[PDB]
Amino acid sequence: DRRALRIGVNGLPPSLEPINGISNTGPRIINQIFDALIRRDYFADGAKGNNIKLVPALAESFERIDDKSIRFKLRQGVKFHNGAEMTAEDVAFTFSSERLWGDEAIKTVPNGRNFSPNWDEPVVEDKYTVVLRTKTPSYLIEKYLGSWLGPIVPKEYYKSLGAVAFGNKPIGTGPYKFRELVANDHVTLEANDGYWGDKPTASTITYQVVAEPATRVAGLISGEYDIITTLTPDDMALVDGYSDLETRGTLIENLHMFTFNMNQPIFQNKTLRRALALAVNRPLIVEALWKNKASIPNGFNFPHYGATYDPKRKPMEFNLKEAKRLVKESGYDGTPITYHTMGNYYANAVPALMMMIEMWKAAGITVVPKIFAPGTTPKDSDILIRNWSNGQWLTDGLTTMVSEFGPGRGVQKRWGWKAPAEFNNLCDQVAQLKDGEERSAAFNRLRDIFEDEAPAVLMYQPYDVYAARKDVQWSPVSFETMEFRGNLNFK
Ligand code: NA
């Protein structure tokens, strides 16, 4: 018979509503309850969980009909876990102004517009045909629909509960249905044997919260968990030493960085930001703390961007002499500069910060750690430097250089980055351009402006480490989620 699967997790998301649950901990549950119109086929063509190939999922087929619209022909007879049939009304509601990107929608789905292209209202043409469209040109609609924005929600059930209550009792069409949630303790899912895709291989999946990695590792050894999440390379020797267990790691499409509150006088100008960027010996941090498993990106540039990945782009430079030169040009007077970090919320954050403080001290810059406890929210006027992480969530270069650092977004509006006019004009263009030499050249120009301006300093692409009992065949994917479709067998 099928075995129950137990996953020892770092935590649970604030909600299981597909958008509001977007976090380091939500997608690994959400991916099981819901399906999107398009699925990223991570293991296609022998790829090691990193293929960017998008394949139809709830959409039987789709045809792009112009630079801003796609007509989807949906699978018919597919049911949500409540017994309701999925139709074009459910898909239109999922990406409607009412639920997702209108002004009232973002009161209960705050990131609905942030994670969306410039949508126009979906058009339901018949029971199973829906045109999803943007107001302005967008050759990124397919990638958005294959991203964490994509999960299809049941209109009648979602509308009767609202986004918050739906988040505590989600209903989707996915291989595993929601059974129960005990806040910050566990989520249990059950096999959806009415699933339109392959039969689920686990009878139940339990995500059990174990805050401390050491206790997660104990639980795996003891037989409490079959898989455990959120380990670092340092934990690999202990786990791999057991003949019944093994680590399963992968580079993830996330970016660890530090950024500045550019409203502060010292960071209004690019000079000290550039001095702080050029003084970081990123290879040293990667060798010492990540066992050379983390990757330094060659600019704001990753292979999963696809046509907008530039493999020939030169690496970001460590130039202590040029950093010292810029410290003098900035007029820095030795006042201590705080670096806000919520402990090791981002893996190895305090150890990396302690190494960077010494690199900054070498360039003649005094940076002091301000390790704020979790839950606390330091006010903006108190932040000088702060660590940040950005999930590189589309299989495209738009996210996050354009989505986070673009015009009207946080880095410019809230954190005062006065980006050069060409950067904002190229940001607007790459959202609308089709992939080609113009689009690829514009991203390289945006990358050059980003490095020149230093609104943030890219540290590295982290290496995520899972551990599992060898009798559970399951491979990680290059994203902060877990995929069990064609990837979960009990030996
Ligand atoms: Na993990």
Beta carbons within 8 Å of 31's beta carbon, 6+ residues apart: 174, 481, 482, 483, 484
Find the length of the chain. 491
The residue among 105, 122, 156 that closes a domain is 156
Beta strands in 372-455 (DSSP E): 385-391
Cα distance between residue 216 and residue 228, in whole Å: 6
| Amino acid found at 312 | K
Q: 3-class SS at 379? A: coil
DSSP assignment string, 245-314: EEEEEEE-SEEEEEEE-TTSHHHHSSHHHHHHHHT--HHHHHHHHHTT-SB--SSS--GGGGGG--TTPP
Q: Do 139 and 42 lie in a common domain?
A: yes
Indicate whether 45 and 29 sit together in one domain.
Answer: no
Q: Are residues 274 and 386 in the same domain?
A: yes
Q: Please count the other Cβ atoms lying within 10 Å of the Cβ belonging to residue 452.
A: 11
User: CB of 73 within 8 A of CB of 129?
Assistant: yes
Where residue 331 falls (left for φ over 0; alpha for ψ -120 to 50; beta otherwise) is left
Residues 6+ apart with CB under 8 A from 413: none
Domain count, the chain: 3
Residue 452 is encoded by which pair of tokens? 């020149």
Distance 94 CA to ligand 1 centre (A): 29
Tell me the C-alpha distance between 314 and 302, whole Å. Answer: 13
Same domain, 438 and 294: yes
CB contact set of 325 (below 8 Å; sequence gap of 6+): none
CA of 220 to the centre of ligand 1 (A): 14
CA of 211 to the centre of ligand 1 (A): 13
> Residue 141 is which amino acid?
I
Does residue 143 belong to any structural domain of this protein?
yes
Question: CB atoms < 10 A from the CB of 270, how many?
Answer: 20
Can you tell me which residue has the tokens 């126009």?
A: 120
Q: 147: domain range?
A: 36-156
How far CA 350 is from CA of 346, 371, 454, 456, in Å, comes to 9, 8, 21, 18
Last residue of a domain, one of 99, 125, 156: 156
Helix, strand, coil fractions of the chain, as percent rounded to 5: 30, 25, 45
Whether 236 contacts 35, CB under 8 Å: no
Based on the fold, state whether residues 121 and 106 are members of the same structural domain.
Answer: yes
Asked if the structure places residue 161 within a domain, the reply is no
- Same domain, yes or no: 76 and 139: yes
Q: Cα–Cα distances in Å, from 129 out to 35, 91, 97, 105, 326?
A: 17, 9, 19, 24, 58
128, 156, 184 - which closes a domain: 156
Angle at 227 between CA 221 and CA 232, to 5 degrees: 85
- What's the token pair of residue 179? 């059974």
Residue matched to tokens 């049939």: 85
Please choose, from the candidates 182, 245, 285, 306, the residue with its C-alpha nearest in 3D space to the C-alpha of residue 471: 245
Q: Taking Cα atoms as reference points, which of 225, 170, 221, 181 lies closest to residue 32?
A: 170
Q: How far is the CA of 8 from the centre of ligand 1 (A)?
A: 10
* DSSP label at residue 86: P
Task: Kindly state the tokens that stand for 137.
Answer: 């040109």
Report d(CA 425, CA 42) in Å as an integer: 33
Q: Looking at the structure, tell me whether residues 328 and 410 fall in a common domain.
A: yes
Resolution given for this structure, in angstroms: 1.7
Give the Cβ contact number of residue 464 at 10 Å: 24
Ligand 1 mean position, distance from CA 229 (Å): 4
Residue pair 463/469 in contact by the 8 Å Cβ criterion: no
| 82 close to 157: Cβ distance less than 8 angstroms | yes
Method: X-ray
Q: Residue 207: how many CB atoms within 10 A of its CB?
A: 27
456 and 468 part of one domain: no
Instruction: State how far the Cα of 137 lies from the Cα of 429, in Å rounded to an integer.
Output: 10
DSSP class of residue 62 equals E
Tell me: do 103 and 233 sit in the same domain.
no
Pair of tokens at residue 133 = 């469209």
C-alpha 348 to ligand 1 mean position (Å): 14
How far does the centroid of ligand 1 lie from the alpha carbon of residue 461, in Å?
Answer: 14
Q: Residues 117, 49, 431, CA angle at the centre, nearest 5°?
A: 20
Q: Rounded to the nearest whole angstrom, what is the distance from the C-alpha of residue 249 to the centroid of ligand 1?
A: 8
Residue for token digits 């006027």? 381
